[PDB]
Design a protein around this ligand. Sequence first.
Ligand code: HEC
Ligand code: HEC
Lengths: 128, 128
Amino acid sequence: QFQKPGDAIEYRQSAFTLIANHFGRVAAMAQGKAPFDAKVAAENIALVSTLSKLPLTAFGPGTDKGHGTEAKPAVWSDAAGFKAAADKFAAAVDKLDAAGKTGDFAQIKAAVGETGGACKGCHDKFKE
Amino acid sequence: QFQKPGDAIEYRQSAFTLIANHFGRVAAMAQGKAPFDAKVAAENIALVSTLSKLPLTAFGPGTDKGHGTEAKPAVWSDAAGFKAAADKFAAAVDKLDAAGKTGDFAQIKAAVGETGGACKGCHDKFKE
Ligand code: HEC
Ligand code: HEC
């Protein structure tokens, strides 16, 4: 779906930006920085879940260069490591999605922690 | 929630990028440039619909300068005009959503044309 490799880069960056913004709204409630509203949390979680399925589809062959990319070469040269990182994130987001549907603060908070750990674990190995 | 103007600008840009990509996938089918797959068209339409509701929430006061923005000052000095352009888009996206639900190629093609017109109409007045 990307005509030029720059397109894949801008797409994945864009998806990550939207994920970070909506995930951050949920995290703010989990951290007690904003009052908890289960409906609003659920809406933001649903968006995170939808968006989470997008960026990791945009690291195809030849999408490694330029356009302000912060993807490390290891994304392509340690593809197994990158896939493990992606799968850990998908598993955490599944739990987050389930938590959003229950409206249980504790379950949401636990899943925010797991999800955030997956963001960081991938970035440590694969993002500048 | 945007902490600084840069955050609003990056968010809206990011959402428009994702919108353009998924909309373009549908458009390619409608224009007779790719085979028609109604399920895939519906999935991309549903994403467009979800996404369409995001960027126009990120043009608050003071988000008019810097950070690579291409928003024209008229976004804020003709707020009613910008809102009219946004509402025209939203109405077109409603029709695109309806078309995704039916799977009707002709209805999808009509809605792609209308939606595209709404992108262009807003850009002509409000985007550098
Ligand atoms: C690997 C499996 C990742 C997971 C899981 C998450 N992110 Fe990440 N992210 C990853 C890479 C390789 C990059 C660089 C993309 C590029 O081509 O430049 C990023 C980038 C981001 C960004 C910056 C986007 C930009 O500046 O344009 C953000 C804000 C971001 N990622 C956030 C983020 C969050 C909140 C995550 C968990 C919910 C997350 N990412 C997971 C790789 C991976
Ligand atoms: C006004 C009501 C708009 C409608 C409807 C659409 N877009 Fe637009 N778009 C608009 C503005 C004011 C801007 C500039 C945003 C900024 O702060 O820079 C944009 C930008 C884009 C972009 C570029 C994004 C980037 O990465 O910088 C794209 C790709 C884009 N818009 C596409 C697009 C499509 C496909 C639309 C219809 C489906 C559409 N936009 C509607 C204003 C408006």
